[PDB]
Amino acid sequence: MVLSEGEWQLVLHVWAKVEADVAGHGQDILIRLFKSHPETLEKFDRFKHLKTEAEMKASEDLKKTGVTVLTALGAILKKKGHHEAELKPLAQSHATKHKIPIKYLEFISEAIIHVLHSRHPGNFGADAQGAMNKALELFRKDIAAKYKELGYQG
């Protein structure tokens, strides 16, 4: 697929707001994911044991991971499609080391869209949510293709 420049503009415009508070958006998105699809919290050996949202909010580890995720995703979105090199290392560790199914990446894409919408309603109308969705779908289609080349396709 190929996003038009106007769609990338809408995606990078709302992402610039996310970047004013990366750690906070990171926390929100992961808790959103773990509350919605708790089985995903099992993939994290570091803080699998967290029982409640309050515990999750107080975990420094969870907040660092959220920043690592968002920093890596933002470097991929900024490429505007030319992300081949950033994807490789990412696909290899999630398919071989952590064993993350494509399905789970759909769940987090869903959590990212939920949070942008709640935090940024003015910059996240229907056209901007459509563009973000296109950008995340593109990301998942290329990572799934790389999983396949790596022998995992989950």
Q: Give whichever of 18 and 73 is closer to ligand HEM, judged by the CB atom.
A: 73
Residue nearest to ligand HEM (CB): 93
Tokens of 91: 């696909």
The answer to whether the beta carbons of residues 1 and 80 sit under 8 Å apart is no
Q: Provide, rounded to whole angstroms, the least separation between the CB of residue 104 and ligand HEM.
A: 4
Q: Give whichever of 17 and 101 is closer to ligand HEM, judged by the CB atom.
A: 101
Residues that bind ligand HEM (CB under 6 A): 40, 43-44, 46, 65, 68-69, 72-73, 90, 93-94, 98, 100, 104-105, 108
Q: One-letter amino acid identity for 4?
A: S
Q: Provide, rounded to whole angstroms, the least separation between the CB of residue 83 and ligand HEM.
A: 11
Rounded CA gap, 104 and 40, in Å? 7
Q: Give whichever of 14 and 105 is closer to ligand HEM, judged by the CB atom.
A: 105
Torsion of CA 46, 93, 154, 31, to 10 degrees: 30
The answer to whether the beta carbons of residues 41 and 50 sit under 8 Å apart is yes
